[PDB]
Amino acid sequence: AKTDSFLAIHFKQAKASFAALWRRPLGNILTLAVISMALALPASLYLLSKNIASVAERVAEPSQLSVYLHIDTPEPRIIVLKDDLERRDEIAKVKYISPQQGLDDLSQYAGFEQAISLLDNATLPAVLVVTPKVDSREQIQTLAKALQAEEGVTDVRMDEDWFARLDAIRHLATIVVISLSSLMLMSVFLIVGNTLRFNVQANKEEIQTMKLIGATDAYILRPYLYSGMWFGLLGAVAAWLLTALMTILLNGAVEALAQLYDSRFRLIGLGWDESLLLLMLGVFLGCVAAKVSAKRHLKEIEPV
Amino acid sequence: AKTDSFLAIHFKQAKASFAALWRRPLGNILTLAVISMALALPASLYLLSKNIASVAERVAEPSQLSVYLHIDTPEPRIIVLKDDLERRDEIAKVKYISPQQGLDDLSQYAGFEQAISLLDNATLPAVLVVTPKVDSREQIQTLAKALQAEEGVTDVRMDEDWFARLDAIRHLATIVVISLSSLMLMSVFLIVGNTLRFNVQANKEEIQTMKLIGATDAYILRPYLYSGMWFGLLGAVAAWLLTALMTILLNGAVEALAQLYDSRFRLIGLGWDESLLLLMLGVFLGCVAAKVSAKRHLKEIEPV
Amino acid sequence: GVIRFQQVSKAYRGGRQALQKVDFHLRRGEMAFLGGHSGAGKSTLLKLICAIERPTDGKISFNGHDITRIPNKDIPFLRRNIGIVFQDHRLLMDRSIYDNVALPMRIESISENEIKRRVSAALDKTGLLDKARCLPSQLSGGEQQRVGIARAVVNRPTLLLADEPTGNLDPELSSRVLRLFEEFNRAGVTILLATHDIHLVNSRPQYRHLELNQGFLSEV
Amino acid sequence: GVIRFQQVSKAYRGGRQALQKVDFHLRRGEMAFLGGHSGAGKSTLLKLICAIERPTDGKISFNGHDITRIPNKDIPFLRRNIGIVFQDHRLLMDRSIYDNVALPMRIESISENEIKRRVSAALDKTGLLDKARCLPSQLSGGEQQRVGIARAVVNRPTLLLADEPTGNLDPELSSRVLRLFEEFNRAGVTILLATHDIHLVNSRPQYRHLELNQGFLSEV
Amino acid sequence: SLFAATQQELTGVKSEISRQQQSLAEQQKSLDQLQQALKQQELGINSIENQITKTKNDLENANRNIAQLNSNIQALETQKQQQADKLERLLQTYYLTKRSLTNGQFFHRSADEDRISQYYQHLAKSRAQAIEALEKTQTELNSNQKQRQTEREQIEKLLAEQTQQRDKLAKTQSERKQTVKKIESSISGNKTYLAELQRNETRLKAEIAKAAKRNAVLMNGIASQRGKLPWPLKGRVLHNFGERQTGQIDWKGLVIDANYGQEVKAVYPGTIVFAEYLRGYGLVVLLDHGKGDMTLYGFNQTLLKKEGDKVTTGETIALAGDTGGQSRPALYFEIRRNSRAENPSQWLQR
């Protein structure tokens, strides 16, 4: 008895399943649109996050280390400490700010044209800054901290991501990312399941007859697997198109803002490597959801 | 042959529809969670948009210039100086803040109630606000220098007047909010319809039996309308709770940020009016989606 | 009369004609057998009478009111007057027997107490009062058919239509089901039974017999 | 033999027992009628034989291979050997007749040309070759039943099971269907027909008759 | 009848003698009651005087605490003014450099945001520390002032107590003078006074004998210090040893005029053997110098030393007074050797 090869049956099933979507255009189009939008949401969020991160990195990437001396230290000892720091290695470049200079800086920051009065000369402690002579950030930071501790410096505020801190980036950003990822997974993993359950229900009699005759379970299941795979792939493509359209929409608004600031900037779309990952994620979610939901719903359908 | 009251049948149908959700826990729970998340996200986006708009409106002041008189300056001298400044050209208007009015403004902030009481006689300098007639920065600087040299002041403070940057940021936020809100509303509207279609397909036999008997169309349609309404209500309530739980965290993060400086800031949450509108929108969307989907799928079912 | 036809004929889309110039009249209280062959128009006639499918040539009168072009919004009111029994004894396996028999009443939104009393009366009349709280799966075939008849007749229909109600039962239960239909007719409910079993119709010649042959009704 | 039972009995969850100590043996080529009453175990027997429901007491042997505890993964291979005919003539209305009759072959993933030739042969044997490209809706009841028989027998089954195949046909077509089954038996296909019609079985006494009564099989 | 007159006359004389004895007994009983009343009055005056001195000492102690509290309050006021000025200027600086976010006062262009934030945080921390210290010092000052006011109120109570004691002492002194006057008027009879003097002198010997047999002082005695003993008190001698005090009773010691409250200094070191109130001598302090040599100091208003206490030469043992019914303050000095009274003039330095 002649039997088709392993690949021929799979290719026929794929083509037939793709052709089957046109039997119910509206039902299979609304689900595709929903999947596309649900997958495009996180894509656009990631795009904006990447753009802002690139802007932040681009603005400036120098390295400077600041050390705050204790208020208790008197003025004459400041010169001695400056000389000692200069003598030691890795301290080639040093700048010192007098308390009067700090007061002037503070007055300028608040918008006063001239240094504010009635603050006295003891408003702020003296501050010194040391440039990083050694490229080793960790070793340089450790050495600076040890030196400051030896000299009795109250605080050692080495340059770092103060804005990121442990409040916004540590918690809020992670929570938002987790929430968006969960929404993406549930929305895609849900609507795909319901559509395939509905399709299986619409073919109750055919499945009953097929099981009665003696068809194997895998033969029953495969068409829905391929339908889900097609759903995922088409949804991923639609999501990519939607993100591209959104970037086109925001190009002008971002250009207006970037022009005003010094840094001239332009929106950048998803990289060509990212598109492959997007398609892989779409097809993976489609296949997994289809397999799980179709098998679970197909368990409870007896031949008679 | 007695018929129940018009309201009684509707109430019974609503109760039955609410009880129906327990038939299939997983699907109903997942769709409800997705609806809640998709209704919560636009709420948070709108909240951020409203906060940015409020800040932009506050910053709308035309770069008003503040002048501080000496603490010991006599009150008649302050009045004479204010009159002279008003008489002087290039000054649009003059506002005088009394020392006790400034004391009240300062006491508005937290942590200052105790100190003011402890001090025998708190004496803030008389703060006077002068609005330049010309918004030009050069004119502002010249007027500030002239006021400092007027020989009747101790300090002068000037504003930032960064209106354009905040306007651009507001425009960008508006575009992003509109786009994402539209996508989420479409997604939630379409997700409901699919679940209603699947539910209608589930009980095909009962619908066929009822239509074979002289059942009316409205009787068959009502339960699905009420199921959609319950979906909308529960989703909207969950979305409001999520929005509150998100605004608390956002307020905490912003307070932590502003704590770096000595000042503090608080977020303006969605008002009592917003919650009612959110519930109304959720109910309307759910009911309309359920009605359209269920009716369209119901037209295509024959008793035999 | 309870129903009358005036040269009614039906032609399917394919081009095959189930009915061609069929004319018969039913007076209230009468019973008929509507015999036919494997083809003929028995099922098509039963579908036409209850307005599931519209005619093409003639006109149909139920109680002097034309049913030829009844608007689709009035079909439920018409169907409320007609009870239908099918060979398949369509039953909702999920629900209980008391629920299946009570569906026609609940469709009209009747009070619970009246529904209970009426359903109890009907089930007692058909002899299934004892098993009113059981599922249809447990019942045997004859019990299922009797439950179907009770569900059909609960709502005091003026005309009762049976579409080969005895298809899936041996003659022993055929006699019982036919006797039950006879009792319902004695109660005053018009009936139009439909069957291709010549033996059953020949058993009882009291009721007028209409033979349907290739879409033509001899009425003899 | 083609099938053998050893004190097999089935008890439903409700507590009602369809079968109790039923024992019969079939030799290849034979035909049986399996008469029974409205209750009895005809349908339960036909369900048991094709492994749709498992037994409780005894053992079942198909060709010397125990089917009592066949793993669920081997059921399709067993069902491929058995053809089943039902009173409802289960047919897929959407597809064409050539597609309905070709489903058993396509399930095995057979080449298109062999499928075409075999389906044409089967349809010619049942006399429906002309309408191989039409939909089942257009066909009459007898034609639909013959299409069902062809679909059942296309795959050269060793044992053919019929579950009241003549439920929805008048005796005139009953004779034709029974003659078709007789021809298939002459071809060498074992058959176990099931019917409650005493007249039909009494018509042809050549084939051994097994009477099933309240779950007991007299075999006389 | 002639012989019976003598017996009858004796009965009449005996009746008169018995009546005189009964009158003398009643007079003696009245004198004893007057003596008992005077002893209570004299003891009460000494007790009242001691209480007045104690109260005065307490008042003096309070005064110094009052000065310390006043100095602490002045220091606290100076610190409060300094800290109030500091807090005022710091609060004014904050009012100048508010930097409120909602008004677009954040993120000044082209500035070291981290460093300016550190400046602001340090300023806020300094403000918090300043207000905490101000509250602490103000609370301490308020608590001290409340305690200081209570101390003044307590002083008021002490003053009230001292005033009441002074009035009682004045009343007691007047009563003692009246009691002394009554005794003197009733002692107008020469016979009665002489008998009372003998009993008091006899009482002194018994007390001296008992004290001598109790504490056997191991001192070397005052024999080697004849003619060099310092005068116990500075005053004019009123009665010399051997002078006729009343009738046939001659003074056994030296009576030296002394001012009220005058300090009495021990002539030589010794151990106190009798520091109780004796009838007819007031407060009497007996000092034993060993070898049977003892010195007695009577009429003291108050006794500072107690029985068994050691006393050094020149140490104040008691305060001169008018105890013992004396009409004027004086100190009775008597020197006894081997239970025999010796003339003090021969022992005291010239």
Ligand SMILES: Nc1ncnc2c1ncn2[C@@H]1O[C@H](COP(=O)(O)OP(=O)(O)O)[C@@H](O)[C@H]1O
């Ligand atoms: N949906 C249809 N389309 C075309 N022809 C049909 C349809 N239904 C039935 N027919 C044909 O119309 C005729 C009516 O047959 P019918 O009265 O239903 O037989 P029965 O009473 O045994 O059920 C038959 O020849 C049947 O094949």
Ligand SMILES: Nc1ncnc2c1ncn2[C@@H]1O[C@H](COP(=O)(O)OP(=O)(O)O)[C@@H](O)[C@H]1O
């Ligand atoms: N799913 C079931 N659960 C419990 N009892 C059943 C079930 N199906 C059938 N029965 C009972 O088991 C017995 C078997 O009857 P059956 O052989 O199916 O009659 P028939 O051959 O006419 O179809 C009957 O009494 C029937 O009521």
Ligand SMILES: [Mg+2]
């Ligand atoms: Mg029919």
Ligand SMILES: [Mg+2]
């Ligand atoms: Mg059966």
